[PDB]
């Protein structure tokens, strides 16, 4: 229901000496469900607590659709009149307010009548499907009805914007499954923006269609998820998104040179950085008749290991250190040779520092 537009917007702590971020750009499309991935200490909580108004940028500019809202350390539109929604890392329900109280407490300055407050709080309570425990305390509940008091009341004064900052820490993985559900089917139902920011990977590929990677300050790369997945503009990135094998290796007319390895692809320095994910090795005893995969020469088995159904096998090359692993239905013995090959247009090649 709102465009986030973030124009060279950077933020500085201990009075120059951090800086937190750094020219970040951005758009963020009105009804978008959009993602930011990066390490502790990116400056992802910096950033979202930017655009919910509770802090402000150093330098440059943040719009809501055409509305300046924040101008370089100035606050233009602050937090209470942006129409936004927030879950934070640290949130916590009122252990001693009702589910009820809890999502009623927002409107208490909001010039609403107590029937006013009732039905607002009910219609989203009905919405979030916890109209039937409002009457309960929070230690009465369920961690995924906690969630869904917590959601509701972030809604409660119908925002334009959901802001979530780490919210699925509470949960396992059974509930974190039903709590990343439950996040898209409440922005569809509403039409909200929604931006959620994390550390964990496994919550961008659930929730955002498009993402933004953040690393020390700076946004280093944007587009949707399967596009950082294949195309990562550096060795960091795609390790960020997912699981990969990286290799240092020499340039030479023939590719680069790892032990008994040969990735045919180049950079235009002495060495270069090899990425490789699991899923485009393949390993063989004998010669591979299928055009679609590349020999790069032999291996040898180091160790095996077993977990979700399939075994993670861990080869070098021959006369190398250097690890690769992949993931088979089937084992191979540790102390084997083997043939190695890869999906050519898969392999992930970077200028060496
Ligand atoms: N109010 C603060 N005072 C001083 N430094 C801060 C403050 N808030 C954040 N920082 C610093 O800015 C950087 C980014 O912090 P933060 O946005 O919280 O990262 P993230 O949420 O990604 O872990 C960190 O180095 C952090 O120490
Ligand atoms: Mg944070």
Redesign the pocket.
């Given at each position: 229901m709102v465009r986030i537009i973030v124009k060279n917007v950077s933020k500085v702590?201990?009075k120059g000496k951090?800086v937190?971020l750094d020219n970040v750009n951005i758009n963020i499309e009105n009804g978008e469900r959009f993602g930011i991935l990066?390490?502790?200490?990116?400056?992802?909580?910096?950033?979202m607590?930017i655009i919910a108004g509770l802090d402000v940028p150093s330098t440059g500019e943040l719009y809501f659709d055409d509305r300046l809202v924040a101008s370089n350390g100035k606050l233009i539109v602050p937090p209470e009149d942006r129409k936004i929604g927030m879950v934070f890392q640290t949130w916590a329900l009122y252990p001693n307010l009702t589910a009820f109280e809890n999502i009623a407490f927002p409107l208490t300055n909001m010039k609403m009548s107590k029937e006013e407050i009732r039905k607002r709080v009910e219609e989203v309570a009905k919405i979030l499907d916890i109209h039937h425990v409002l009457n309960h305390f929070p230690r009465e509940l369920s961690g995924g009805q906690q969630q869904r008091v917590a959601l509701a009341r972030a809604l409660v004064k119908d925002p334009s914007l959901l802001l979530l900052?780490?919210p699925f820490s509470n949960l396992d993985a059974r509930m974190r499954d039903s709590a990343r559900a439950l996040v898209k089917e409440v922005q569809s139902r509403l039409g909200v923006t929604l931006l959620v920011?994390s550390?964990d990977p496994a919550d961008i590929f659930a929730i955002a269609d498009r993402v933004g990677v953040?690393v020390k300050?700076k946004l280093v790369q944007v587009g949707k998820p399967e596009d950082l997945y294949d195309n990562p503009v550096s060795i960091q990135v795609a390790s960020l998104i997912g699981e990969i094998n990286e290799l240092e290796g020499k340039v030479t007319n023939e590719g680069v040179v790892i032990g008994s390895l040969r990735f045919p692809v180049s950079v235009s320095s002495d060495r270069a950085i090899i990425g490789i994910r699991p899923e485009d090795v393949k390993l063989s005893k004998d010669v591979i008749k299928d055009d679609s995969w590349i020999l790069v020469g032999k291996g040898k088995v180091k160790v095996i290991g077993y977990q979700g159904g399939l075994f993670r096998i861990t080869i070098t090359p021959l006369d190398s250190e250097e690890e690769i692993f992949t993931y088979s239905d089937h084992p191979i013995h540790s102390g084997e040779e083997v043939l190695v090959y890869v999906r050519k247009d898969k392999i992930k090649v970077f200028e060496k520092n």
């Open positions: 702590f201990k951090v937190a990066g390490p502790s200490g990116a400056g992802k909580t910096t950033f607590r900052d780490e920011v550390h953040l300050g």
